[PDB]
Amino acid sequence: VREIVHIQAGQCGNQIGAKFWEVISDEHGIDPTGSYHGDSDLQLERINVYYNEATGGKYVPRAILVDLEPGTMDSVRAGQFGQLFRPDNFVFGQSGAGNNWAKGYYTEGQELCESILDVIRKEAESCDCLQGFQLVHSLGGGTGAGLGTLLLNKLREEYPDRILSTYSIVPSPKVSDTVVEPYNCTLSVHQLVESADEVFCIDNEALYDICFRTLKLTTPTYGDLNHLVSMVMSGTTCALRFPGQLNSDLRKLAVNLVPFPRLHFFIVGFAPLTSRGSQQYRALTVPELTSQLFDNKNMMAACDPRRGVYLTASAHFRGRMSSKEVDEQMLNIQARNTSYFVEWIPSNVKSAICDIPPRGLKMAATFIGNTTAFRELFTRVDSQFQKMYARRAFIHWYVNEGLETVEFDEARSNMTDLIQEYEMYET
Amino acid sequence: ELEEKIAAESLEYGSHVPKSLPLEYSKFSANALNLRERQRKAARLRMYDDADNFSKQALALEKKQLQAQNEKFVRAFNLNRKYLDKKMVEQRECFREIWRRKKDKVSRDTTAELRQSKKAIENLEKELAEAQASVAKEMRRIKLNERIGTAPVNARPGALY
Amino acid sequence: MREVISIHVGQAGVQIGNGCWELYCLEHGIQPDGQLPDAFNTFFSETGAGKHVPRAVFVDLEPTVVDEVRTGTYRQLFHPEQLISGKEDAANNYARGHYTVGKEIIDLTLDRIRKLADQCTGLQGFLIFHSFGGGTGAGFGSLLLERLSVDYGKKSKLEFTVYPSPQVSTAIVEPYNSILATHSMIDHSDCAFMVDNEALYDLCRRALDIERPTYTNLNRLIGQVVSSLTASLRFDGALNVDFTEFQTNLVPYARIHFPICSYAPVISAEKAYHEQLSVAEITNSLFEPANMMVKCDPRHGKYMACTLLYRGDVVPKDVSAAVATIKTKRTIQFVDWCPTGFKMGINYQPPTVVPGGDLAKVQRAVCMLANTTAIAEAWSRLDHKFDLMYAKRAFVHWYVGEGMEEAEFPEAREDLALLEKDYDEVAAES
Amino acid sequence: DEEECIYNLIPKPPPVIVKEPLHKSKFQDQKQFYTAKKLSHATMGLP
Amino acid sequence: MRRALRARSLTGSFQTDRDCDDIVESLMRGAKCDTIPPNMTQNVITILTARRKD
């Protein structure tokens, strides 16, 4: 009875969420038509976290779908698990996305926001309890980057106690999928820094590298990439759904990992990864999970932890294991590699254990880290923002929508201040 | 001192009330700018009598949504104020809680120190009463001996000198 | 006739309680549903037609751990009013579990324990379990003790708490939570015992031969001591020690009450085939630094008065011979005041085993509670860890945001300093 | 207690609450229990 | 408490706002639009847009 509201916004968020419901429905044992035919009584214990029950044994997820154009909605509507969603929860406009942050935030966002909030209010007030909100969006586009922040601000206005955890995808360092990303990302950061409580950053390039290096995928489609992201989102809330020897929910994670209000951007990872044909050679044990978790190549964000220093880190374990083994391993990784962990915080590594692992695996682990290495990512976008802005260039398409030039200067000022804040605490 | 800190906090919150509608709320929507663009391009042609119609159509739309955003701003300000108000109530709740405990510490230690002396006094007062009872009994026997009596047993002599 | 109340708070307390009540129910001969297939009534209350109910209260601000018992086998044993569950946990935050969310459930908790005490005609103490690093174990634990002090006054309140280990840690804000709970417990507790996971882990691997223990194995070890500690009130014995007797014998002052515990023999099945473990051997095994359940070396400091408890076919002369040999140890340092320095007890009931257990069926066993100055090592570690964080104000915003006033942080630091001062003053030369 | 001489002022010395430096415990040797051998970097190799 | 609810300048400083307010007031009294300094037009446009809305 710690329900979580899930919101999908934008092209990227909608597809990731679609795979995410397949992952849960398999774990809990729900048919695509919403019938329960599972295999364990434990799956029905706390299914209320993610689902509402319709009279007749039909289970409906707490999902809200948002887009400016119905293009991606129709693809999900034809999906395998498309029948699962509530038909009235589909909210969309009738205008092109525009790929413009100002247009999404100001021009079409205002019209859509009033309907979206009441759709949220139906699900938020329908359940016995509500811990926090779950948002999926990207930071390079116009719909997710703009309208997602607008809904985040409204959510912070109405519900100032709940945890506003969001999952975001950051533009890649080498080749990126939009011309005007530095404008969109810098504007989006200023909203996210103040309004949110947890932000998880995922990079597409690292997902490609992880697929080829470990999974040996010759042709990794977006389906596999969304599958990799879906595991982490399942892992974080698993402590709510199943019993364990040491429970650790969202607010425990926020207090442990966040030492100052603004340093709350996080890197994520998952282990183990089934190499096709090669895992026969590998002996999966708890120390092996730790080796993959703290390996720099498994991180989903292309920021090298070794070039920075750690502040806090957290690991979850799923399955029947020894508690002494877990507490010893966190000790060993912190003692053998001292230089990267700060001094003025002892016991930088948090741990947690849950007895029920996912299907097929015997044990699974999730790694969430916080480090100064994020200054690499913000420096990357700042230089792109700076030099384009000097030429003015694409500004013409944001000014006409009603955005004044002071917003660019304010967004850079806050974003640069965030960079220095990671600089200062390295001492 | 806590009351002074709360008063300073209250002053700080209300010091910076904007004199006009802030920037984020200040913008229009699509249906206003589109009508402005068609109005401006109509007047560029020698078709003024239709541009004037578009302007008068767009004015009544800007006038609506501007005051529509005004109510949202006022509601948001009031909701932010109510959050700060419940927080400072919680601050006072902690202060009365901590000093309730601080009062209990003294209220127990002082009563314990008195309780040591209270029983000691009551202990000796009972000892004195029982001691005086023997003296009164011997005096009563000696007084009654004044009119006929018999000799009693004597105490132990020669203890130590 | 003589009764004890058990309170379990947080994850660590209630998960220990599951193991303890398994040990008690099997020892007396009661099936888990509370029926029969004596000393029953010191831990249980009897209803008509032969159903027994324990004297226990299970409280945590989150329902997952408690609902395990509600769905488990023991659901038939407890009274549903006893099992109390909150809505959202304290998130390892002291201020959250004391002021904001702890006060929501406190008066509901206090009504039940007081209601449970009405049936207890001869109650003589309380048994309370904590983990100092947790938000509920410390924040709500400190709140619970403060009320019980004024609600019940002069009734001995004994605690069994998990102290933060030197090296092993699972919460980053753990040093913050321990110091704040340190102030409340030093004034209100009649006597508080100390245990830690790090020493119990090493004990559960060396003495008991286990490659990879879990929380379950450690919880059975603590139950043995509490069962041995309370065995004087339950079964017959040649020398009996009531709760007031440990209280006066162990402590010379009010603020020097903290003991440390030990137990012997802790042996595996295939080692006891060789080691006999008679009275002289088990008494010697107690004083080794290996068997201490808190990782603080007794050789670092000196010993004050100690208490020994024997379970089995033990004769008083063998006790006197063993204690005499211990006083011949020059590696053991005693304070020159208290030349006596010992109180011994003997009971005629062997320890109790558990199916799928870890211990051997030794026919005689000994338990030790001792007062020593070595615990000053344990606080100095906690003191240093706190100073590094508070110098840079590492996590203050979380605690301030939940109502806590910052002035409490130096005050709780100041109080721990006096406690460190007090122990060294007494430990100083006569 | 109505005397005029009392009226002028009631000064107080600096706070008798101890300005003393915080007590330093004697029990500071800790190599018994802080035991794990620290290394700069083994598992996470150099950049 | 949110930055949107908090007061903010329409330019780099309130002093620039006062200089802009002075020139806008001069414009209100019939001064032609070419009297504005070339670098100064941007702040004038932003404030005029804000004050029409007001």
Ligand SMILES: Nc1nc2c(ncn2[C@@H]2O[C@H](COP(=O)(O)OP(=O)(O)OP(=O)(O)O)[C@@H](O)[C@H]2O)c(=O)[nH]1
């Ligand atoms: N011996 C033992 N210790 C445990 C067990 N479970 C948890 N712990 C200890 O409990 C300590 C921390 O307390 P928490 O787990 O946060 O429990 P809590 O007081 O309820 O805190 P919250 O759940 O956040 O309210 C950890 O250091 C663990 O070592 C257990 O089953 N056995």
Ligand SMILES: Nc1nc2c(ncn2[C@@H]2O[C@H](COP(=O)(O)OP(=O)(O)O)[C@@H](O)[C@H]2O)c(=O)[nH]1
């Ligand atoms: N992982 C993943 N990323 C995607 C997918 N589809 C799009 N993206 C990424 O999302 C980013 C921006 O998406 P965009 O179309 O602008 O979303 P918008 O905000 O709704 O406009 C691009 O850089 C894409 O790489 C997908 O199916 N999976």
Ligand SMILES: [Mg+2]
């Ligand atoms: Mg708890």
